Amino acid sequence: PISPIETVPVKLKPGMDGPKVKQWPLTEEKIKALVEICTEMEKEGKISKIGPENPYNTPVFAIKKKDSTKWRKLVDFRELNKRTQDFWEVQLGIPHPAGLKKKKSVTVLDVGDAYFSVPLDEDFRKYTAFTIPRYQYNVLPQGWKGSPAIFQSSMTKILEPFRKQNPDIVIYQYMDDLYVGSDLEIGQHRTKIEELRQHLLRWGLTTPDKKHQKEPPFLWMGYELHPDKWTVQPIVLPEKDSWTVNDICKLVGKLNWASQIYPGIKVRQLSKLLRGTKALTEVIPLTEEAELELAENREILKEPVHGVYYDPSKDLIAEIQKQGQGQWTYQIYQEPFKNLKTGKYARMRGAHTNDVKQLTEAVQKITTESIVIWGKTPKFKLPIQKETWETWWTEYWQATWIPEWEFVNTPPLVKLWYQLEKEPIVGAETFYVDGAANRETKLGKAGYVTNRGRQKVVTLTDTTNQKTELQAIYLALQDSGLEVNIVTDSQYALGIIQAQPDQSESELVNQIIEQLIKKEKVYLAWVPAHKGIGGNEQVDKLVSA
Amino acid sequence: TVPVKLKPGMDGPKVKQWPLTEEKIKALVEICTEMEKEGKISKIGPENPYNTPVFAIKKKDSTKWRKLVDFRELNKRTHPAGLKKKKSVTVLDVGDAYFSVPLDEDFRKYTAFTIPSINNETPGIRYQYNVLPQGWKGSPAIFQSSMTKILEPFRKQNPDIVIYQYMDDLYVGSDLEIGQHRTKIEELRQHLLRELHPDKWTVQPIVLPEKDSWTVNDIQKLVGKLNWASQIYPGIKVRQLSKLLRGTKALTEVIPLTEEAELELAENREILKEPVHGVYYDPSKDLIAEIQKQGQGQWTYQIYQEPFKNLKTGKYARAHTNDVKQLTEAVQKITTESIVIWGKTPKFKLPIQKETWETWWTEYWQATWIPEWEFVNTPPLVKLWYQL
DNA sequence: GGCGGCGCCCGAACAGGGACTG
DNA sequence: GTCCCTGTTCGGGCGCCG
Ligand SMILES: Nc1ccn([C@H]2CC[C@@H](COP(=O)(O)OP(=O)(O)OP(=O)(O)O)O2)c(=O)n1
Ligand SMILES: [Mg+2]
């Protein structure tokens, strides 16, 4: 039936007008399905026969539904959508089973032909015109950009009084999918379910009996809900011989979907396989690291996994582990070996970075994801020494902070692989470095002058001033012993190196990092260029030619 | 009602709501039920295409939560110089009064907000304001007439007390002694129901090392600092000190300061003691406030409008310390200073990654307003230059 | 082959700052 | 000014849900 709720006032954008688009030819199957649907909808008041006074049209078509022998009528409303006012979406996100608390009794309801039970603004119906090889919509259509928001809000309004007088019953509301949980006995629960279904009826919403689940395991939002466990509906990865960009996109999307409950999923190398591509049909040969990463993911997926349900009275604990190459896995649990859920973080921020930075980024991702699913920050267990963190917190010139955390020594550990000195080292040879690069010819020079009288200048091709300053620092590091003072004229290089990086997109910064690690003491100092200072003056005169 | 339009060619705010903890959400639901019953807000739908993020803060030692709407975007699209010079200035919340004046009907759509739900159990519940929203830069503007009417007799009978309205609260200033001041503020509170000491706010200068043994490194550092400084005080000379480094020496080598060089250093210290030349406040341009983390819970800041023309410089000083919390207390102190001095909040350049600040800043926010901010990666030379 | 929500990942477009030319 | 480097944003693939 049609809901008696008020309709949402809806307008076109100013100066705009309805769509006039011809009707594509559909197969005999789609035409039969569409006439069988439309005759009944017009009988029911959901569409109205229209005539020459409606100068509008939009193409319709059909697709087989979820898995059933039933059909879905869609309208390619792209035009009308480009010409319809903006909406504010109310679906702020997707619910997750890990945020569900254990309930004694549980049922999942579906609403039948959902959109088609919510009415449509009377002034707006004309624009929804269509034809079959001519009706207009009186209810929410599928393909119109405003239907999801108007439906979700209408269903919120309908459920409002029931919730208001049934606070002990949880109704998780994804668009027309209702999860209903209670601590009532099966009998009282099924009676309250009946009250709910009658309520939805008074507001025009049928809950079909075929789509009514009453017994575990419930299929819900992509998962299987058991009384004490939840699992993910089976994830089947493609086993292609040759791979195309679209195929790796499907693969990595399915691995990302798995990463919520399968621990240790990694996509770094499969993701790299998409760097330079230009076509969803282009073929990509796997690397060897791609082979290994995908094999590992498959061997993970071949194992039986499950999550559990939240207990608000216990503590949320999030525990993080370092994978290779800026990738991280985490597990959120409450009791030692029984995960609420799992996840991964592998977002590569910054040209140069260290593990302490990535670990912080991961901690705040987990924090926001947990605020969403439970409304609570977790207690963290990180592979980083309180001393490492305190050292970094002290010597790092930006504000950084991590919530309550405790240390676990499941390696690999998070370490600052080197520490710049605060004061210059007595007796250590003192290196004044510099570099220059001709902007026209891309030629350059880099080198050092020391206090003991050592000089060096290497010539470089196809470089830039920044690259050549870093080359100078690298020169000093190579030709010095375990303790060295270095004086540079570039804030760029100084600023990279004081961040204490342990990885870099640049090969030169990687080589510099290896040299810094080898050293026992390094002291880096900055002088203003072109000022006639110290040895800066002579190395500057030396690398210009 | 007072009709309100927007700045021309601008459209209403469309800012997504951010996550809220369970206790903030619970307070927001309680507060918005009470506010809807009293007609101050009304449930709306998705056909209002506008949105503004909402959250809640806790009262100092009280257990009442305050609803805080972040109207920075809506404000973007819509003062006595003697206040700085008073002995005591008290900040006094008056935003509640704005809930008596209705809001222009055609404009109420721009105030919409969306309360979220844990785990997305329900779509967000949208509301709009029907009365003057607190946090909006239009509420004190409209309510100015009624406030002037309210304070006419108090201002008359207390001609030496300075009252300045900024968005949701009054700033009441006097040269009185703390006891008399407290009494008069209570007089004003009782009358209106129909702390800070800005004379002690001083300028944190730029200071140079004083020491009796200088090394090549120390003098290189000093020359770098003075070089960066001459871009502010153009009378700073470095010639002699820079001469003291001729050659290629070890950083640890001691370098005795010559008479000429020591005279250069003394005259440089004197120069730094002078006020900056040619810094005029422009009330059309926006205030920039830059912050540097100096470690040990010590923060430096500079308020300016054009580079090197600093209007104010200062410090914030405060075991189990929280960097983010110290930073939000810092920006709140700097903003209160700017609202006393210039009647205008600054645009902050925060030395923090956007995600850390955005996760945690609301946990520590205490004031009704919210300033503009950008996030920046500080060049370490600047922290080096403004440090103490 | 239509829509909205959230997720990931990559690249294009842009902003901003430091260093440099004659 | 130009060039070089770095960071953020946004949109377009795909995934998942209805
Ligand atoms: N591919 C899809 C699937 C769903 N929906 C929208 C239309 C209303 C709701 C449909 O959910 P279904 O589970 O398909 O239910 P239905 O349309 O009400 O039909 P049924 O009677 O089979 O539940 O979400 C959509 O726009 N596009
Ligand atoms: Mg349905």
Give how far B381 is from chain A: nearest CA, Å: 8
- Residues A458 and A509 both lie in one domain: yes
The three state secondary structure string of B146-164 is HHHHHHHHHHHHCCCCEEE
Pocket test for ligand 1, best of A3, A110, A213 (most atoms within 8 A of CB): A110
Q: For residue A160, what are the contacts with CB-CB under 8 A and spacing of at least 6?
A: none
For helices A491-498 and A465-478, give the axis angle rounded to 10 degrees: 60
Please determine, looking at this structure, whether the domain spanning B282-385 carries the CATH number 3.30.70.1450: no
Rg (C-alpha) for chain B, rounded Å, is 25
- CATH number at A441 reads 3.30.420.10
Between CA B297 and CA B287 the distance in angstroms is 25
Residue B238, CB half-sphere, CA atoms under 13 Å: how many? Answer: 21
CATH code for the domain in which residue A238 is found = 3.30.70.270
* C-alpha dist (Å) from residue B291 to A103, A482, B81, B312, B385: 50, 36, 25, 12, 12
Contact criterion met (CB below 8 Å) for A60 and A73: yes
B227 vs B237: CA distance, rounded Å: 8
Q: How many CB pairs under 8 A join A and B?
A: 203
Contact B331, A336 (CB under 8 A): no
- Greatest alpha-carbon pair distance for chain A in Å reads 99
Cα–Cα separations (whole angstroms), residue A407 to A319, A355, A362, A369: 10, 15, 16, 21
Q: What residues contact A523, with CB distance under 8 A and at least 6 apart?
A: A420, A421, A423, A424, A425, A428, A484, A485, A486, B251
Residue A233 near residue A223 (C-beta atoms within 8 A): yes
User: 3-class DSSP state for residue B217?
Assistant: helix
Listed in sequence order, the residues at least 6 apart from B167 whose beta carbon sits closer than 8 Å to its beta carbon are B95, B134, B135, B136, B137, B139, B140, B368, B369
H-type alpha helices, chain B: 22-37, 72-76, 139-142, 144-157, 178-192, 216-230, 239-243, 259-273, 323-341, 354-360, 380-386
- Alpha helix stretches (DSSP H) within A302-402: 355-373, 386-395
> For residue A152, what is the nearest residue in chain B, using CA coordinates?
B123
Residues A337 and A401 in one domain: yes
B24 Cα to chain A: minimum distance (Å): 9
Cβ within 8 Å of residue A296, ≥6 positions away: A264, A266
Residues 6+ apart with CB under 8 A from A353: A326, A499, A501, A502, A503, A504
Question: What's the Å distance between residue B286 CA and nucleotide D7 C1'?
Answer: 24
Q: Which atom of ligand 1 is nearest to the CA of A113?
A: 18
Is the same domain home to A437 and A530? Answer: yes
| Secondary-structure percent of chain A, ordered helix, strand, coil, rounded to 5 | 30, 25, 45
Whether A279 and A212 share a structural domain? no
DSSP letters, A124-149, are GGGGG-B----EEESBPPSS-TTHHH
3-state class (DSSP) for residue B352:
strand
Strands B347-350 and B288-293: parallel
Whether domain B196-281 has CATH 3.40.50.2030: the reply is no
**φ, ψ dihedrals at A334, nearest 5°:** -125, -40
Of B46, B295, B353, the CB nearest to A87: B46
Residue A386, judged by CB atoms within 10 A of its CB (0-12, 13-18, 19+), counts as: exposed
Q: Is A232 on the interface with B (CB under 8 A)?
A: no
Beta carbons of B250 and A393 less than 8 Å apart: no
Helix axes A491-498, A507-518, angle to 10 degrees: 60
- In sequence order, the 6+-apart residues with CB closer than 8 A to the CB of B33 are none
Do A440 and A521 share a domain, yes or no?
yes
With residue A161 as reference, give the H or E element that holds it: helix A147-164
Angstrom distances, CA of residue A128 to CA of A30, A84, A117, A140, A521: 19, 11, 16, 10, 74
Do A221 and A280 reside in the same domain of the chain?
yes
What letters, b where the CB count within 10 A reaches 16 and e where it falls short, cover A482-495? ebbbbbbbbbebbb
How wide is the angle at C-alpha B4 spanned by C-alphas B1 and B10, nearest 5°? 160
Q: Which one of B14, B224, B250 has the shortest CB-CB distance to A430?
A: B250
User: B60 pairs with which residues across the strands?
Assistant: none
Domain end position, chosen among A417, A441, A469: A417
Type and span of the H or E element at A22 = none
The answer to whether the beta carbons of residues A469 and A493 sit under 8 Å apart is yes
Would you say A265 and A297 are in contact if contact means Cβ atoms under 8 Å apart?
yes
**For domain B1-78+99-139, which architecture applies?**
Roll (3.10)
- Residues 6 or more apart whose Cβ sits within 8 Å of residue A219: A108, A213, A225, A233
> Which of A533, A155, A373, A276 minimizes the C-alpha distance to B120?
A373
Phi and psi at residue A522, in whole multiples of 5°? -130, 140
Q: Are residues A60 and A103 in the same domain?
A: no
Determine how β-strand B54-58 pairs with β-strand A352-353.
Answer: unpaired
Question: For residue A477, what are the contacts with CB-CB under 8 A and spacing of at least 6?
Answer: A484, A486, A512, A515, A516, A519, A522
User: Domain range spanning residue A249?
Assistant: 217-310
**A211 CB inside 7 Å of strand C:** no
Q: Are B218 and B211 in contact (CB under 8 A)?
A: yes
A75 near A63, Cβ under 8 Å?
no
DSSP A203-246: TT----STT-B-SSSEEETTEEE-SS-EEEPP------SSEEHH
- C-alpha dist (Å) from residue A334 to A313, A362, A383, B23: 10, 19, 19, 20
Breaks (C-N over 2.5 A) in chain A follow: 133
Query: Going edge to edge, which strands form the sheet with B169-174?
Result: B88-93, B169-174, B162-166
State both tokens at A103: 């309930």
Query: Contact B376/B343 with Cβ under 8 angstroms?
Result: no
Instruction: Give the CATH number of the domain where residue A122 resides.
Output: 3.10.10.10
Element (H, E) at A41: helix A28-44
A140 and A25 assigned to the same domain = yes
Beta bridge partners of A525: A487
Angle at B137 between CA B136 and CA B142, to 5 degrees: 100
Instruction: Give residue B303's region: left, alpha or beta (phi > 0; psi -120 to 50).
Output: beta
Asked whether strand C has any atom less than 7 Å from the CB of A436, the reply is: yes
Q: How many CB atoms lie within 10 A of CB A51?
A: 6
Q: Is the CB of A151 under 7 A from strand D?
A: no
The answer to whether B345 and B76 are in contact (CB under 8 A) is no
SS3 A522: strand
Give the closest residue to A98 by CA, choosing from A362, A293, A324, A376.
A376
Answer for the pair B10, B98: CB distance below 8 angstroms, yes or no.
Answer: no
Beta-carbon contacts of A78 under 8 Å, excluding residues fewer than 6 positions away, are none
**Torsions phi, psi for A323 (to 5 deg):** -90, 175
- Give dist(CA B272, CA B269) in Å, integer: 5
Is the CB of residue B19 less than 8 Å from the CB of residue B118? no
Q: Give the nucleotide with minimal C1' distance to the Cα of A437.
A: C20
Partner B contacted by A88 (CB < 8 A) = yes
| Min distance A222 CA to chain B CA atoms (Å) | 15
Distance (Å, whole) CA A217 – CA A225? 5
**Same structural domain, A39 and A177:** no
The amino acid at residue A524 is L
Q: Do A143 and A2 have their domain in common?
A: yes
| CATH number among 3.30.70.330, 3.30.70.270, 3.40.50.360, 3.30.420.10, domain B82-98+140-195 | 3.30.70.270
* Nearest in space to A354 (alpha carbons), one of A517, A503, A497: A503
Q: B378–A398: do the CB atoms touch at under 8 Å?
A: yes
* Radius of gyration of chain A measured on its C-alpha atoms: 32
Both tokens assigned to A397 = 């010139």
Q: Which two structure tokens, joined as six digits, stand for B384?
A: 């080096």
User: Residues of A with CB below 8 A from B350's CB?
Assistant: 399
SS3 B52: coil
Q: Which helix (H) or strand (E) holds A497?
A: helix A491-498
Judgement on whether residues A283 and A345 belong to the same structural domain of the protein: no
Indicate yes or no: CB of A88 within 8 angstroms of CB of B46: yes
The answer to whether B46 and B107 are in contact (CB under 8 A) is no
Among A129, A147, A165, residue at a domain's last position: A147
Distance (Å, rounded) from C-alpha B329 to C-alpha A266?
40
**B120 — alpha (psi -120 to 50), left (phi > 0) or beta?**
left
CA angle A423, A424, A430 (to 5 degrees): 160
Same domain, A320 and A446: no
Cβ neighbours of residue B61 closer than 8 Å, sequence gap 6 or more: none
* Structure-token match 């990885």, residue found: A503
Do the domains spanning B1-78+99-139 and B82-98+140-195 agree at the CATH topology level? no
Count of domains in chain A?
5
Q: Are B280 and A455 in contact (CB under 8 A)?
A: no
Q: B313 near B203, Cβ under 8 Å? A: yes
Query: Which residues make Cβ contacts (< 8 Å) with residue A537, sequence separation at least 6?
Result: none
Best mutation site among A116, A176, A210 for ligand 1, i.e. most ligand atoms within 8 A of its Cβ? A176
Show the 3-state SS of A249-318.
HHHHHHHHHHCCCCCCCCCHHHHHCCCCCCCCCCEECCCHHHHHHHHHHHHHHCCCCCECCECCCCCCEE
What is the dihedral sign for C-alpha A215, A216, A220, A225? positive
Local structure of residue B298 (DSSP, 8 states): E
- From A177, A197, A216, give the residue that closes a domain: A216
Tally DSSP H helices, then E strands, for chain A: 13, 24
Q: Give the Å distances, CA to CA, from B139 to A351, B95, B344.
A: 46, 9, 16
**Token code pair at residue A194:** 């009946």
Type of residue numbered A166: N
Q: How far is the CA of B384 from the C1' of D8 (A)?
A: 27
Domain ranges of chain B: 1-78+99-139, 82-98+140-195, 196-281, 282-385
Q: How far apart are CA A310 and CA A291, in angstroms?
A: 37
